[PDB]
Amino acid sequence: ALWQFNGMIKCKIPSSEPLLDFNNYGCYCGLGGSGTPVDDLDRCCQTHDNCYMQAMKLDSCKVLVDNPYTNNYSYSCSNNEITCSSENNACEAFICNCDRNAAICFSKVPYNKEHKNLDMMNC
Ligand SMILES: [Ca+2]
Ligand SMILES: [Cl-]
């Protein structure tokens, strides 16, 4: 769920308020998306959106209203490393992996302030 994703991003980027810094960025960082990613961070967000789409294709998520932004899962942050838990069931585990991969991706790409609150005519 969004709560866990926020904490994962803070795990990798301890100075951030992720729900501010990484929402309404580019064409993809925020709910849904369109167009061509404007930079590698936006591409991280495109991949994450795609991962949530793939998740929802799984029968294990379809059985539970396991909507990735609201589906709680278990993970830890320790020494700024994210670990998804073996106690997660299949849908939860898939979402946790999507979120972990995106958090790591965000932490390894430039953050370009010119792409914050981008005009969608760019998308
Ligand atoms: Ca999105
Ligand atoms: Cl990690």
**CATH assignment of the domain containing 89:** 1.20.90.10
Q: How many CB atoms lie under 10 A from the CB of residue 93?
A: 19
What residues are neighbours of ligand 1 (ion), with CB under 5 Å?
28, 33, 49
Return all residues near 35 (Cβ < 8 A) that are at least 6 apart: 27, 120, 122, 123
- Judge contact between 1 and 69, C-beta under 8 A: yes
Kindly provide the residue ranges of all beta strands, DSSP E only, lying in 1-123, ordered along the sequence: 75-78, 81-84
What is the three-class DSSP state of 116?
Answer: strand
Domain that holds residue 91: 1-123
Kindly provide the resolution of this structure in angstroms, with one decimal.
1.1
Task: Examine the residue annotation and report whether 115 is marked as an active-site residue of this protein.
Answer: no
Q: Which residue in the list 42, 66, 99, 115 is annotated as catalytic?
A: 99
10 vs 6: CA distance, rounded Å: 6
Compute the distance from residue 123 Cα to the ligand 2 centre, in Å.
Answer: 30
Single-letter residue type at 54: Q
- Judge contact between 33 and 49, C-beta under 8 A: yes
56 vs 93: CA distance, rounded Å: 12
Beta bridge partners of 82: 77
- Judge contact between 92 and 22, C-beta under 8 A: no
Method: X-ray
Pairing assessment for the beta strands 81-84 and 75-78 based on DSSP bridges: antiparallel
Compute the distance from residue 29 Cα to the ligand 1 centre, in Å.
Answer: 5
Number of domains in the chain: 1
Task: Examine the residue annotation and report whether 99 is marked as an active-site residue of this protein.
Answer: yes
- Judge contact between 103 and 83, C-beta under 8 A: no
